[PDB]
Structures are given as C-alpha cells and as structure tokens.
Amino acid sequence: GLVVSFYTPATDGATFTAIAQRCNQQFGGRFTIAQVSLPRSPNEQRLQLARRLTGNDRTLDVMALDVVWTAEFAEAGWALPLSDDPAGLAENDAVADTLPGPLATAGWNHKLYAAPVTTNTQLLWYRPDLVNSPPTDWNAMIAEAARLHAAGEPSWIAVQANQGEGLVVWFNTLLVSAGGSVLSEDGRHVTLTDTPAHRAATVSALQILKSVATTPGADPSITRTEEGSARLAFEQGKAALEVNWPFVFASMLENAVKGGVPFLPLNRIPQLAGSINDIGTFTPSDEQFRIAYDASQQVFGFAPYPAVAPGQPAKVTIGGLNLAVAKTTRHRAEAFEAVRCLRDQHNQRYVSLEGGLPAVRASLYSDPQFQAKYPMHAIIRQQLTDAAVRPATPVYQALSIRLAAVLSPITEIDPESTADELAAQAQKAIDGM
Numbered sequence: 001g002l003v004v005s006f007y008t009p010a011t012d013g014a015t016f017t018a019i020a021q022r023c024n025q026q027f028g029g030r031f032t033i034a035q036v037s038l039p040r041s042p043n044e045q046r047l048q049l050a051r052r053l054t055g056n057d058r059t060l061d062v063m064a065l066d067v068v069w070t071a072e073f074a075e076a077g078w079a080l081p082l083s084d085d086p087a088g089l090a091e092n093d094a095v096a097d098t099l100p101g102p103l104a105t106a107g108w109n110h111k112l113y114a115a116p117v118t119t120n121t122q123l124l125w126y127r128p129d130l131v132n133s134p135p136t137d138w139n140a141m142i143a144e145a146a147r148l149h150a151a152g153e154p155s156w157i158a159v160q161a162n163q164g165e166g167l168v169v170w171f172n173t174l175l176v177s178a179g180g181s182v183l184s185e186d187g188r189h190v191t192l193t194d195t196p197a198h199r200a201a202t203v204s205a206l207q208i209l210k211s212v213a214t215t216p217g218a219d220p221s222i223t224r225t226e227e228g229s230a231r232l233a234f235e236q237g238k239a240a241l242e243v244n245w246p247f248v249f250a251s252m253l254e255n256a257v258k259g260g261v262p263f264l265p266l267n268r269i270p271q272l273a274g275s276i277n278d279i280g281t282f283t284p285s286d287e288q289f290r291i292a293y294d295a296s297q298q299v300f301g302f303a304p305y306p307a308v309a310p311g312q313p314a315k316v317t318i319g320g321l322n323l324a325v326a327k328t329t330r331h332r333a334e335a336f337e338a339v340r341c342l343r344d345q346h347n348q349r350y351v352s353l354e355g356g357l358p359a360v361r362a363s364l365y366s367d368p369q370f371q372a373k374y375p376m377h378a379i380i381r382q383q384l385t386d387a388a389v390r391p392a393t394p395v396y397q398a399l400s401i402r403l404a405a406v407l408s409p410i411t412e413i414d415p416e417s418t419a420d421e422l423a424a425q426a427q428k429a430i431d432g433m
C-alpha cells in the first residue's frame with residue numbers, strides 16, 4: 001500500500017530500519033514504513049528537513065527530531081500537534097508509560113508536537129585497571145588526568161565536544177550544574193550574566209572548560225577544527241576517562257568482539273566466536289553476554305557524570321529523538337499509527353539493547369530482564385529525573401551556532417571576558433525573533 005517515509009539520523013538508520021521492518025509485518029499490507037537517513041549533525045538534520053518542509057515535499061511523513069528542534073518545528077507549523085491525529089490516539093499514546101523528562105522536550109506552548117522515542121544522558125566511562133576510583137567532580141577529573149599523564153598512562157579526558165552542538169551540550173551541563181541557565185524560562189531573556197548568581201555560574205562553567213582543555217597530556221585536537229571521536233579515543237586506549245552518551249557501552253562490547261579494542265581482546269575468547277551476526281551486530285546469547293560483560297568490567301566501568309559542586313550530583317543535559325508527523329504528509333492517520341508502532345514496548349527494548357539509545361518507556365527501567373542487559377539503567381534513570389535542559393526556543397539553531405563559536409577553541413576561554421561575549425552573542429540570536 002502507501003509508503004510512510006521515516007527520516008532519521010544516518011548513524012541510527014540501521015537500528016530504525018530494523019524497527020520499521022518489524023512494524024511493517026504488523027500493518028497487514030495496509031502501508032509500509034520506509035526509513036530514510038539524514039546527515040550526522042543536529043544542524044544538518046534540521047536543515048534537510050526544513051528544506052523539504054518549506055518546499056512542500058509531499059512525500060515527507062515522519063521525522064525523528066532532535067529534542068532541541070521542538071520549539072522551532074512547532075512554531076513554524078512543521079510538526080503537527082499530536083491532537084491532529086485523526087484517530088485521536090497519539091496524545092494518550094505519547095504520554096502513557098513514558099518518562100517525564102523526555103515528554104517535556106516534546107512540548108511547546110502547552111501541547112505535545114512529537115512522541116518521544118529515544119532519550120539521552122552522558123555518563124563517565126573509565127578504565128578501572130588504570131583509575132582506582134572514578135572521579136566524582138570536575139576538579140577530581142583534572143587531577144586524575146594529570147596523575148595519569150605523570151605515569152605515562154593515557155591522559156586525554158575524552159569529551160564528546162569539538163566546535164558544535166556537543167560543546168554547547170557540555171557547557172550547558174556545567175552551567176546548569178552550577179545553578180545557571182542560558183535563557184530565562186520563557187526564552188525571551190539572556191540569563192548568563194544578568195544577576196551575580198547567574199554570572200558566577202557562567203564563570204564557574206567556563207573555568208572548568210578552560211582547565212580541562214589545558215591539563216597536561218590533553219588531547220592535541222582541541223585547537224584543531226577536525227571532528228574527533230571521544231568514543232574511538234577511549235576504544236583505542238588514548239583516554240582512560242571519557243564522558244559520553246551510553247551508546248559507547250554497546251560499541252565497546254561489539255568492537256571488542258570484532259578485535260578493535262586493544263586492551264579488551266574479546267575476539268580471542270572462543271565462546272564469543274560467531275556472536276557477531278550476519279549484518280555485523282553483536283547479538284549474544286545470555287551466556288555470551290555474561291562472558292563479554294564480565295570480561296569488560298576489568299577494563300571498562302561507568303559512573304555518574306562528574307559534578308561541578310562537590311557533594312551533590314550533576315544536572316546533566318538531556319538528549320534524544322522525538323517522533324513528529326510532518327505537515328506535508330498526505331496520510332496523517334497512517335503516519336500517527338506508524339509513530340505508535342515505532343515506539344512500542346518491543347521496539348523500545350530493541351532500540352536500547354541493539355541500538356544503544358536509551359528507551360523512553362518507564363517500564364523498561366523497572367524490568368529485571370532489561371536491567372540485566374542494560375547495566376547502566378539506574379544511573380540513566382536518575383540523571384533523566386533531574387536533567388538539565390538546553391533552552392527551548394524557535395531560534396535555537398542560531399543560538400547554538402553563536403554560543404559554539406564563542407566557546408571554541410576552549411583553550412582560548414578567558415572566563416570573565418568570555419562570559420560577557422557569550423551573553424552578547426546569545427542576545428543577538430534572541431534579537432532575531
């Protein structure tokens with residue numbers, strides 16, 4: 001029958017292809033979901049979609065939107081409100097058994113414009129064979145990287161953050177963790193420097209970025225404008241401390257079994273041979289998972305994101321993907337039906353355990369069979385409960401570009417003057433409304 005296109009980031013395309021294929025057996029030939037890949041960066045994902053939306057591409061049906069695009073797409077009329085479902089089922093489906101942090105990212109002006117499908121929060125990843133105890137705060141992280149550098153041990157702090165959205169994410173986490181915020185609640189004022197408490201938070205966050213950037217043994221790619229991978233730096237043994245999204249867990253086991261992780265040679269364990277399936281994905285039996293996970297715990301551990309203020313947890317910026325129906329669709333009913341299928345319980349288990357993307361369904365975090373294959377479940381749920389959020393604003397794209405340009409390169413941050421430049425550049429973004 002008809003085709004419901006489903007646009008997703010390319011790096012998630014294989015996972016969402018598998019989910020769509022399952023969702024295609026259950027429609028009785030009524031319609032087919034066809035996954036289509038978007039570029040790698042949040043900005044380029046947005047740009048492709050926005051061009052199809054303003055060009056009235058009537059073949060565009062469902063979109064997996066980064067959480068930061070809700071306000072823009074809702075205000076533009078690009079994402080239909082869930083109340084536009086002709087079946088009247090989308091709003092109830094979106095909220096049922098769904099964690100509240102993800103749902104907050106899918107709303108605008110008191111209505112839902114998307115149904116959460118994946119969430120995200122960054123954890124600390126470390127080498128327990130080199131790091132006795134995982135650092136609990138950023139001053140401790142810096143001390144540990146220095147101690148490692150002294151011992152001729154891998155010394156990079158691998159943070160997912162070059163010159164783009166990931167750097168804004170890192171700054172946002174530090175800033176909110178310190179009690180600050182980029183914008184006011186309504187999104188209409190810049191709050192980086194408008195009170196002494198807010199200025200103090202901004203300066204504290206910038207001090208951490210500068211200190212990490214200039215720790216002995218720091219990654220030489222900080223000043224270069226290339227796009228390194230924190231994930232691969234850690235897997236290659238160049239960092240013993242990494243802060244990153246939880247997909248690094250599935251990557252570590254899979255790549256170790258393929259022989260790509262020097263300090264974790266799971267490829268030499270006979271019981272794991274053939275645990276990579278015919279399309280390249282680690283697909284262990286329960287016993288194979290136990291063997292791989294137990295081996296990995298010697299060289300790979302996880303911990304909460306480091307705090308800014310010692311003694312209480314960080315407030316960690318939330319990420320993820322929300323499913324929206326484009327205003328271009330010719331088939332609203334089928335597009336909202338597809339959204340409900342893509343986020344059902346079975347596909348939520350798959351997106352986390354095979355795809356590495358945290359599920360949004362609250363039940364899974366209380367399910368012992370999920371918890372046994374997703375060992376970071378409790379820290380993830382904790383960090384999703386008191387999450388930092390990036391500012392929700394229709395001019396987010398312009399705001400993020402302006403902030404990233406001030407922050408990068410982080411070796412050049414001067415906390416007091418950089419705080420004023422950040423506030424001035426944020427104001428310019430807000431003024432374009």
Ligand SMILES: NNNC[C@H]1O[C@H](O[C@H]2O[C@H](CNNN)[C@@H](O)[C@H](O)[C@H]2O)[C@H](O)[C@@H](O)[C@@H]1O
Pocket residue numbers: 009011012040041042066067068119120160161165166169245247318319320321356357
């Ligand atoms: N395949 N696992 N990768 C996870 C996820 O990472 C990105 O999204 C996350 O980071 C974004 C910032 N850019 N990071 N360099 C952030 O905006 C987003 O909210 C996070 O979910 C990828 O964009 C995404 O495709 C990946 O799924």
